[PDB]
């Protein structure tokens, strides 16, 4: 009877159906305030009062576990409370999930809910973009929890909706608290200090809007760490980040767009196995038998046949499918093409064949009864393409003859688009049955490919527009060709949709070729990072940002690293138990954070060792000269790599913080560890009585060999609490003076029970501190001092103490007090092996990585690091300027943020209007506060003068490095039957603009290295309504091809549906993170136009 | 707590000389800044063995239990220092 | 049902008559280990085992008040324990 049980049902008819809107990360989790709601209800029931009549107070609420709500099922929560002890607990399978205190307020003071005054604007942040930001951050809230009506730019004030639901209201208050704080990743509440609820004041604090809705005002105060809204008052909220689910529900279908000649002669060359196999067979199913079968030549023919298929329907028949096995590859190759109904039938003249029925079961059909591996004229067929290689093998293809007459020729090559009305007139009458042939002659810069692709699927006149004639001679008037009656005959004989003449050869554009694996480049600056979080097999060498930018300020210096040391924090970060945001510093950019110390040579070649806050594992390190020491002549760099962090921590704990005097008793936990060994050495040098807890007997033997001043009475066992009895018996019941504790719970209490009067406790552990475990304060009656020791605080400020620590370490190095530990060396090509080795605690001393071997000399100036192959990455110098066209909305802001995170300090954004939405203003303010100078300009791109002025304004800030075209005008929903010249004219701001950008960059931008424009899938696959859009995109690809051929940079990316900024042509929206990742992958590719989309 | 947190810009103070009882000792420790030192000279909250959250030590904080009565039995070396300071 | 209640009677016929021998100072006080005994019995009952078959461990036991046993009367003690939180 004391245990109240609550059943949580998320069915469509359950009263708790609104909980389905809590999907923090691909998972429906019980709200952290639902526990408070159920506890409040239970307390009200126990007191015999209603919830609305009971002002309640919560204290020291702690969450221990996350509850997952299944879609088909029911979970039960039991809540029990102790009225005398004034506590409560929540458990599900007898497992504690929530604990704390709860009691009646019994004296509500309305002054507690008065809004604190802010320490410090027409713009404000509206609901849609607030939850867009939350979705980008990771929070997929639903309509029931979308209670934030209006929010301020900095996230400290706003309005909250009231729906007679306390769970949603408190969840919205928590959302408002976490909105303003800028952290990367999802953060879930874990600890709350106090919550106050007064429903009478809550009802008194509500007012109605003209929309007949009830809202309340919310303010968030970071100085006071309080969030108050209506009648609710949260104080001391604590949040910790959770690991990403890594669902990877966005598999990107990636391809490249290339021009494929119809007659490929001598293909399948520059191979490896085929070349040797040719002579192997000459001297004497099979790779030699199927060399062109697996080549992309078949894919191009298949794509051409699909594009020739009149409707999306397609029937394929396999003949003699008993010997050849092409039936196991054709269905797979047609998967990338969306919206394609394929009926594949396998027919064999001998029914005894086709024993692989399971293979045929993979969406195929069987039967029993044009592609084959002067007789062609006997059948009276037309040859389309021929594929002959060094295999002598030939691949043929014959089209389907379809008689037709009345060839309409329409000159499309013309400005002002007056031909559109003529095309409409030609395509007006449905009873035409005569092919239409579009002609582009006097402009290779034509996008009629996209126009014919989009118009070919138009309802009405779909097959009317048959083929195009594009002369894309991408050369400086090198080749020469002209169409004519004789020239048309060759093209008109084969009714092919695509007919393109490119610098001598006739062919078609192919969007079917796939992509390859990561690219690598030989570099001198690199680091190691985990490509996939939590996986130790994904550790590889990645090019670093130190090559492009080497400012080397007075408070900085660049040093080449020969040896780097691994620490426990590195293992925690690599395996995923530790979040990158826990590292102290300005690490808002997702990058490697592995390493804390190194050893190598500085700019002058002097042999130096040092300590860094992060990015220790690298081929080079940029750091202040304060955190450096000189390696004595008797040391080699190998053992020198192990000194800095260990001895620095030991000295800071013992001398600076503990103030140890000679002739005292010390207890050093885990004496075989690095910090333990350093503390032992320091204490023995000071002449002190030392007790050490040790894990095994081998470690005891090693310690005895290392420190001959230790006797058998100085060792205890670190795997249990017997060390307490040992020290209490060998010290005569007095205890020790200093404890250097690094052990976990039920051993920290034992350690503090070993303290003597005027004792000092030195805590260097983290877990027991991070969990906010309780500590009995009766120990302070013994005149005891408790120390929390963290060396990480010295990398941000308070250099006065760091100078003291540096002086102490240097003095220790001068004499024999500081001794290097023993090290295990792993080469730079076996970093994964080093991580695996250190992951298990079977090592003694330190684990170091030999980045580069040490030279026998003493001062080797000009020590250029040896070239090393690493994964390519894109970084930008800080002395350049970058231009984003139309980047003040949607994908533009995300691209600008991505570029800024990669080291961009000068940005110019162009928009038709100014900064209108609050989201843009917030982003601009945040970027400006970061020290990046950003300028918004209203200069047009379609005009020559506007482009020149924009380029001059960009060059005023600094040299121009890259230009990004994202401007778009959508006259969509414009079927061909209603498309005028004016709409297709105004649908070209990224045509005149792009041409002007090309000309101006070729004129006065000699240091340019990035030229990126954003296309769409409709340019290659086609869409019904976006004819002019595809027309623009295709020729925007054409200009990129020409400028790439000219030698200047040029890239065009075909994007599918993009989410997080709002299905088209059967393509799912792609998340922004995957979009940026594939963009980074594409930027290093050598191709000119690339595609990316997610298949439905 | 709110007064000091608002007049110090949300940073806190460096030293706290606390002589107050429960539900005020917690408030005092919530006013501590980074590298702060807490000086406890009270007895009741220490005599009752009340719990203390050890998450505050992640701020590189030092906790001091101060009792002058220990100087009347032994450890005259520190008493000489105190006497010299008073003089 | 979760709260086990124990009645303490110091009459000449009660099974707990021996508690009359705890007179620390002119007053009959409940022994500090009687609380441990009743808590142990309650835990054994909750686990469905006998006291003599249940090895038990206590931690951080704190006493807040002194219970006076009247010669003519009866006091009742309610003991509640949280198995998940491992407290009482």
Numbering used by the authors:
A (entry chain A): 857 to 976, 981 to 1144, 1211 to 1295, 1313 to 1316, 1379 to 2067, 2079 to 2112
B (entry chain B): 1729 to 1815
C (entry chain B): 857 to 944
Extract from the study:
An ACP carries substrates from one enzyme to another, sequentially following the chemical reactions. In metazoans, all essential enzymes are included in a single polypeptide chain and are arranged into two main functional domains, each carrying out a key chemical process and named correspondingly the condensing and modifying domains.
From these two separate reconstructions, we generated a composite map of human FASN incubated with 1,3-DBP, in which an ACP is seen bound to the KS domain. This composite map is of sufficient quality for accurate modelling of most of the modifying and condensing wings. For the modifying wing, we also applied symmetry expansion followed by 3D classification to separate particles of the modifying domain into two main categories, with (about 32%) and without (about 68%) well-resolved Ψ-domains attaching to β-ketoreductase (KR). Comparison between the two reveals motions of the Ψ-domains against the rest of the modifying domain, which remains stable. Indeed, we observed that the β-sheet of KR serves as a hinge allowing progressively increased motion from Ψ−KR towards Ψ−methyltransferase (Ψ−ME).
